[PDB]
Amino acid sequence: MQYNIILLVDGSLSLEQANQVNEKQQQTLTNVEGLQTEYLGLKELAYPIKKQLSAHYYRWKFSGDNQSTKDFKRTANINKQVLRELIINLEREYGYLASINPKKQQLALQKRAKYDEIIARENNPENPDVPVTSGLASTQPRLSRTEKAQKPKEELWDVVQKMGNFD
Amino acid sequence: YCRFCAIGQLRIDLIDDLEALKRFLSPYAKINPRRITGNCQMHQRHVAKALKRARYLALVPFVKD
Amino acid sequence: EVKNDDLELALKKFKRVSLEIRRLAQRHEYHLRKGMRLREKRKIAQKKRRKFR
Amino acid sequence: ITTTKPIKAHFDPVADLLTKINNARKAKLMTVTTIASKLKIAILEILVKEGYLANFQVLENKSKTKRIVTFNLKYTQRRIPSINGVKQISKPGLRIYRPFEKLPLVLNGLGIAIISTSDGVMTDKVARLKKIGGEILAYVW
Amino acid sequence: QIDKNGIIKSAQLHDKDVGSIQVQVSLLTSQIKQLTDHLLANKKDFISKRGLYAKVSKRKRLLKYLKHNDLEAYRNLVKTLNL
Amino acid sequence: SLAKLGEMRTHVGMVKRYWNPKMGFFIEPERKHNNDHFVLELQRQSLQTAYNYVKEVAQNNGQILFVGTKNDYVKKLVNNIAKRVDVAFITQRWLGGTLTNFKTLSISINKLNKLVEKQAENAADLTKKENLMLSREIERLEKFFGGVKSLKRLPNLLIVDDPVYEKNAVAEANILRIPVVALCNTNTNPELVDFIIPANNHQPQSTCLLMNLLADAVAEAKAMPTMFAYKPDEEIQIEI
RNA sequence: GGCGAAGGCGAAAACUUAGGCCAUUACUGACGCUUAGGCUUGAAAGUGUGGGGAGCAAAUAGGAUUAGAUACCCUAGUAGUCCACACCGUAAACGAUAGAUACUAGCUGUCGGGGCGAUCCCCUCGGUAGUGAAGUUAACACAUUAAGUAUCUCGCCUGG
Structure with missing residues (x-):
């Protein structure tokens, strides 16, 4: 199925040769292909592994047989041209949706209001707004109604009343 | 706290969101609990798994520098 | 910590950094029951919670 | 007029009705609903005619094939329930x-007993007049 | 999710069914075969074992009730295929 | 009229987000300000019926005591009632072992009388520390039980401005079966007393007109001023 | 805080699988409860086999208080350990509480979704600590997150 792969190439090396060897490593996927030729540019490893003070970052997004990415996890991680093969799919805690996209107006609103950049408004980033209307769209309702009204007798004033005039 | 809970996506993944990671991660390369990060509970596990991957990914060190 | 050159500021943070390192090393420098091994952290969190809500 | 969370099929209507009545007596509830049951209709009607029961109404949802029945456990306006147990x-x-030979009074004769004998439900006292016995379902007062 | 839309829509017991006895038991047996293959491939999976026992016994009591409940609405899947 | 809506503008209101549904027939749902608000017409009718009942029973001229200090303004109002229309009162309330048994309070009033009679002679002639001690005993009298000076019996009606603030005044009175009038605010049943009043006094603008209308509903019996029964007189003031 | 048949679940990643939760105005026509019998796993310690043993480690060897220090103190130190096959079957496996059905005030909050709605506040349903009235009780105290009320079955106890 859908597969995004974050690549960790070995040590410090040229960008293009690493791109080519990462393509060769993606070839280890039997049919998980349709890659878009792109990369994340240069990003160094924040800590030396034992002599690797830096590396290069590449992203490969494509789709294919889900069973046939385990062999990639073997080959990329074993062969000394990829160190980490990070895979994205549903087994990792998922939340994606192809129809929840119409919520990026909230994205613009939060980018505006993650920190209030105007002197007039300096509200905390964790304070309410309250245009509230309380939409539900999920109730599990049943429309029970009365059709036969027998024995007219109801209980509405069920609060006690006692102890009349006392001397 | 995370922008993801403020937009609506119900999941995150390591798309090099390191900036917000630095808000959740102390300069000591250790993951602060849910209190500091500010996620509710779901984006909390999302950023937890992302930080653990970054540890594996060498995006963030375990402790070694 | 990793850096310390301030006269009076960084030492107080270094104190809690050392406390955190001790708490993190007091679960794998010596083998024990995982019960108390996690109970120490849970009790520390609980004590830090109720003192300041 | 259902209370909330419409009642599903219990192991038997009488047990679910008993739970509803005990909960009404305990947690200050007045009108309770139960699953559709002809015997429930009959017992509610006879309790109404006995004077210990308030209004009872059969209820239907968007459809008419399924049914339920609600009833006000008779409460006076001074917070007292007509049914005590x-x-x-x-x-x-x-x-x-x-059988008919096995119909005694109700704990002094003050209470009311109910039997499912031949067709519908009959009080043990009136069942003794028609020399009718049967399986006695409940004692109430 | 092995099968969710295959057997309950391609097979109609009555005029129309979205969930019934025999469509459910057919899907249940399809998942039974899938899970048996899975546990043969990986022998240390016991949650599947308990789920399979629950599924097959629920199917058995489904058929038992449908014996009297309907005249004949069960003679399409009362058997097992694992030999 | 009585219990008029000119008296109910912010009378309703209570603690934020803490309430039990034992209050069933008088409290309305609240989630805007979390301060539990209440319906008003039912309060008007109930308070008018209560006024009729209290005037009918006060035509017999029964003893009544003022015990409520939910807020400072309640104390000020009960002081006003005591200085205008009173027959007996207590400063704060019964402290326990004093209501269901008035022996401890009959001896209290007798000892107050005898202490005044005895201290009329103490003129700083034996020990100045001791006369300060006697003045301090008087001070403790006003604090704990300075109100019990003219009540020679058990009152037929006992005002309770809050069931959670009048623990002794409710419990000991309920040990016996004297009529008791109480409020019910946020976390109790409205059926713990004879006549039902779901009114409240925690709100700054409530207890003023509440206490005035309660006082002028009985003050007419003793041929004493009555200025909040059907008059347009009303107050809009904060608690003080 | 959630997912959890129990036992539990956290360096990650993924194949697969399972359980869900919310909502479906829906279908077989209630097609399900417990469990004789049968099936399954089972924390952990340890065992034969083959391999490994990095590390500590009983038993303890030696040593320190000691009236004794055999328990508690320190070092040396192997069985043990560890990987898989086969055997493990118990735990203070508990919720000191086997379940399933149906029903029953609330609240501070919060979690998963349906969510209007920067996030929100705010809820709908299930869950997650407490709460206190009915109810419950030998008391502990529980209470709609019952030790509450009724329906059906397996396990047990009749003083030590």
């Missing part, structure tokens, strides 16, 4: 059968 003689696992 119930007991079941016949049980789903043991339907005790008591």
Whole structure:
């Protein structure tokens, strides 16, 4: 199925040769292909592994047989041209949706209001707004109604009343 | 706290969101609990798994520098 | 910590950094029951919670 | 007029009705609803005619094939319930059968007993007049 | 999710069914075969074992009730295929 | 009229987000300000019926005591009632072992009388520390039980401005079966007393007109001023 | 805080699988409860086999208080350990509480979704600590997150 792969190439090396060897490593996927030729540019490893003070970052997004990415996890991680093969799919805690996209107006609103950049408004980033209307769209309702009204007798004033005039 | 809970996506993944990671991660390369990060509970596990991957990914060190 | 050159500021943070390192090393420098091994952290969190809500 | 969370099919209507009545007596509830049951309709009607029961109404949803029945457990306007307690003689696992010769009074004769004898439900006292026995379902007062 | 839309829509017991006895038991047996293959491939999976026992016994009591409940609405899947 | 809506503008209101549904027939749902608000017409009718009942029973001229200090303004109002229309009162309330048994309070009033009579002679002639001690005993009298000076019996009606603030005044009175009038605010049943009043006094603008209308509903019996029964007189003031 | 048949679940990643939760105005026509019998796993310690043993480690060897220090103190130190096959079957496996059905005030909050709605506040349903009235009780105290009320079955106890 859908597969995004974050690549960790070995040590410090040229960008293009690493791109080519990462393509060769993606070839280890039997049919998980349709890659878009792109990369994340240069990003160094924040800590030396034992002599690797830096590396290069590449992203490969494509789709294919889900069973046939385990062999990639073997080959990329074993062969000394990829160190980490990070895979994205549903087994990792998922939340994606192809129809929840119409919520990026909230994205613009939060980018505006993650920190209030105007002197007039300096509200905390964790304070309410309250245009509230309380939409539900999920109730599990049943429309029970009365059709036969027998024995007219109801209980509405069920609060006690006692102890009349006392001397 | 995370922008993801403020937009609506119900999941995150390591798309090099390191900036917000630095808000959740102390300069000591250790993951602060849910209190500091500010996620509710779901984006909390999302950023937890992302930080653990970054540890594996060498995006963030375990402790070694 | 990793850096310390301030006269009076960084030492107080270094104190809690050392406390955190001790708490993190007091679960794998010596083998024990995982019960108390996690109970120490849970009790520390609980004590830090109720003192300041 | 359902209370909330419409009642599903219990192991037996009388047990669910008993739970509803005990909860109404305990947690200050007045009108309670139960699953559709002809015997429930009959017992509610006879309790109404007995004077210990308030209004009872059959209820239908968007459709008419399914049904339920609600009723106000008779409360006076001074927070007192007309029904103070119930007991079941016949049980789903043991339907005790008591012929006409086995119809005594209700704990002094003050209470009311109910039998499912031949068709519908009859009070043990009036069942003794028609020399009718049967399986006694409940004692109430 | 092995099968969710295959057997309950391609097979109609009555005029129309979205969930019934025999469509459910057919899907249940399809998942039974899938899970048996899975546990043969990986022998240390016991949650599947308990789920399979629950599924097959629920199918058995489904058929038992449908014996009297309907005249004949069960003679399409009362058997097992694992030999 | 009585219990008029000119008296109910912010009378309703209570603690934020803490309430039990034992209050069933008088409290309305609240989630806007979390301060539990209440319906008003039912309060008007109930308070008018209560006024009729209290005037009918006060035509017999029964003893009544003022015990409520939910807020400072309640104390000020009960002081006003005591200085205008009173027959007996207590400063704060019964402290326990004093209501269901008035022996401890009959001896209290007798000892107050005898202490005044005895201290009329103490003129700083034996020990100045001791006369300060006697003045301090008087001070403790006003604090704990300075109100019990003219009540020679058990009152037929006992005002309770809050069931959670009048623990002794409710419990000991309920040990016996004297009529008791109480409020019910946020976390109790409205059926713990004879006549039902779901009114409240925690709100700054409530207890003023509440206490005035309660006082002028009985003050007419003793041929004493009555200025909040059907008059347009009303107050809009904060608690003080 | 959630997912959890129990036992539990956290360096990650993924194949697969399972359980869900919310909502479906829906279908077989209630097609399900417990469990004789049968099936399954089972924390952990340890065992034969083959391999490994990095590390500590009983038993303890030696040593320190000691009236004794055999328990508690320190070092040396192997069985043990560890990987898989086969055997493990118990735990203070508990919720000191086997379940399933149906029903029953609330609240501070919060979690998963349906969510209007920067996030929100705010809820709908299930869950997650407490709460206190009915109810419950030998008391502990529980209470709609019952030790509450009724329906059906397996396990047990009749003083030590």
